[PDB]
Write a protein that binds this DNA or RNA. Structure first.
Ligand SMILES: [Mg+2]
Ligand SMILES: [Mg+2]
Length: 253
RNA sequence: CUUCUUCAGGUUGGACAGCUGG
């Protein structure tokens, strides 16, 4: 890879409540050993065979360690892993036609990072995604989520795809003609957005000033769009901005 | 043989504003 940060991507996906589906997912009337075997074979053949075939469809830079049953462990270029996470979610949702959900954790590590710690950390992220519960009123976690590089960046799959990826696409399409001072301006935007929690007024003013400085190579309309996002959807905006910085980092790859 | 030693009127306007390269 030529553009991005020289980082390995570790993906760990797991179907939510597959054991519950095997216990009581099938209605009691349609319970037989043949139906149970059909469901088991569907799941197993999907994971093993179809993950192989789907990753062979386009030359993803992935190095699948294990697919097996209900689980997944793949290591590759972090951009390819991030791109294939949504493809995996969509293909699983098609295959099950939205009867089972999948949780994933995506870790980002350097090449010489310990493999034991890669596995442990990405498992922790996958557990955090399985801990996803948007409202503290329901019973049992929603579990249909993905964790992005850190246990604080747990987003649902719909949230991830729609919000984060449309924001990342807009940022990419509006930030490609920035200067090398613009990169530092994006860094400052990220720092200000992270600090907004402990600085309500001065920090939003500083963000407005930074957008003012930027709105000469990005346009006034997108500066206003970023300002609106910062006051409405901040954590998604921070996620998209960090992903853009890591994807466009010119420190080899 | 005379007094005025200066009085009156204008008192800034328009233009450019950061661009390239790593
Ligand atoms: Mg599971
Ligand atoms: Mg499992």
């Amino acid at each position: 890879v030529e553009v991005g940060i020289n980082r390995l991507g570790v993906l760990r996906a797991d179907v939510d409540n597959l054991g519950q589906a095997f216990i009581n997912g099938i209605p009691d009337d349609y319970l037989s050993i043949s139906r149970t075997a059909t469901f088991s074979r569907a799941m197993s053949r999907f994971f093993k065979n179809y993950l192989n075939q789907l990753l062979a469809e386009k030359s993803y830079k992935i190095n699948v360690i294990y697919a097996g049953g209900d689980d997944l462990f793949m290591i590759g270029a972090w951009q390819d892993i991030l791109d294939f996470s949504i493809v995996l979610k969509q293909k699983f949702a098609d295959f099950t036609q939205n009867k089972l959900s999948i949780s994933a954790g995506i870790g980002m590590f350097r090449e010489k990072y310990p493999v034991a710690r890669m596995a442990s950390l990405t498992g922790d992220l996958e557990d955090a995604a399985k801990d996803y519960k948007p409202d503290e009123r329901a019973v049992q976690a929603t579990k249909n989520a993905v964790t992005l590089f850190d246990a604080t960046n747990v987003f649902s799959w719909d949230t991830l795809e729609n919000d984060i990826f449309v924001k990342l696409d807009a940022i990419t399409k509006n930030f490609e003609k920035l200067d090398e001072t613009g990169k530092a301006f994006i860094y400052r935007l990220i720092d200000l957005l992270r600090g907004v929690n402990e600085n309500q007024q001065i920090n939003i003013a500083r963000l407005a000033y930074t957008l003012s400085r930027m709105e000469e190579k990005i346009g006034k309309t997108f500066a206003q769009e970023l300002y609106n996002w910062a006051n409405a959807d901040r954590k998604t905006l921070i996620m998209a901005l960090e992903i853009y910085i890591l994807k466009t980092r010119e420190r080899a790859a």
